[PDB]
Symmetry: C2
Subunit: 238 residues, 2 copies
């Protein structure tokens, strides 16, 4: 079995579909509307927004394409990719971030890139013209750090985070390490937050939705993953 072939349509959609681009504009448009609303409501502390990087601001789909072509999945040559620092900005992101900056709102890029990829990450953010592309605003993941809550909490110490942007539920508060059933129920419970405080972007290529199927164990063999993937489809029995 070649697991990477199973990614192909998801990757192809993400890389080529205008629908994908439209969803990014929709997310950033909605985020801008909600940013204005939040500023008009006012805050107790200095306003901030938080964004994930990969598949929220920066497009890493060329790496996923590489995995399809080579048959070698993530993280094969992921660090090589990060070091090239050539991911493109996703639709709407830069203009939204420049708008945010124009309103005096601080931006925090909370990303699970490794802290030792900061230089490459700054390089890529400078290349795409993302504001506040500095160590003070780019909060990467420490080795052994679980999730992002620690960085969110740090930001919330000094800022009232009025919006979160991401492609993975764990880019928002309240969705860490849950089973498929539990994270899905959590979405239902927090349904009012989406498009309000949590601005979500589509990423069918990879993420916690997949990790959750493996109980977050990617050390599973390819054969194991293949069975899990098949077993979790809900098929029409004609």
């Amino acid at each position: 079995v070649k697991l990477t072939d199973q990614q192909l349509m998801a990757d192809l959609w993400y890389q080529t579909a205008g629908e994908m681009k439209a969803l990014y504009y929709q997310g950033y448009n909605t985020g801008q509307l909600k940013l204005d609303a939040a500023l008009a409501k006012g805050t107790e502390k200095k306003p901030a927004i938080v964004l994930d990087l990969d598949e929220t601001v920066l497009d890493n789909s060329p790496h996923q394409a590489m995995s399809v072509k080579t048959g070698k999945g993530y993280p094969y040559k992921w660090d090589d990719w990060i070091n090239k620092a050539e991911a493109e900005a996703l639709p709407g992101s830069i203009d939204f971030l420049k708008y945010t900056e124009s309103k005096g709102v601080d931006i925090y890029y909370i990303s699970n890139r490794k802290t030792n990829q900061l230089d490459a990450t700054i390089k890529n953010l400078e290349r795409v013209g993302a504001p506040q592309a500095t160590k003070e605003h780019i909060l990467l993941q420490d080795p052994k750090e679980k999730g992002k809550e620690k960085r969110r909490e740090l930001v919330s110490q000094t800022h009232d985070i009025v919006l979160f942007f991401g492609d993975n539920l764990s880019d928002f508060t309240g969705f860490d390490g849950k089973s498929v059933k539990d994270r899905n129920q959590a979405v239902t419970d927090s349904k009012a937050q989406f498009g309000e405080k949590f601005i979500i972007f589509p990423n069918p290529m990879y993420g916690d939705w997949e990790g959750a199927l493996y109980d977050y164990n990617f050390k599973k063999s390819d054969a194991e993953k293949d069975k899990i993937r098949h077993d979790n489809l809900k098929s029409f029995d004609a």
Copy 2:
């Protein structure tokens, strides 16, 4: 070679990912906000909204999952599936539609289901609690091109304040364009998304795929496989 296998992750995301559900809530939440705003300002004609059905209101992913499991691509058992009228509603859809109806807004389900699938479609919509599940509000495909004619028809008597869909051709201005041109059209219309055009994620199938084939699905699995690979952009 086993072309259906290439859909597996797209389907699995759509069927299982909480992120998918959140995107549906996001879209319908935004829809409600924008509907209220539109109603506050008033319209010249009676307000309406337009929704696509498949992968917008009704979830057909069990059919696509079946395709993967059996290795049998479209149209295998599609009509069977439609006839079973057992698709579930997509997250947020039904409460949004009920809200909409309560505001005196007419709903038009403009769908490229075939006009001979109307009874099944009504059945399925009734089953999930979609309001206005009647022939007057469900505008299915005439075998004699796209949905613009139906949209224009509704616009004669209603001011359509919102459009909902998973495929760009669910909105005006995206019919039969190349990948390059439909993508540029999205850029050109970027302000509309989340404002007048509410989009939902569907990586399983759609005009995004059709456009890669120049809308000619009379291709072998081997032909589609080559196109698909050639349109992935790797790095050096």
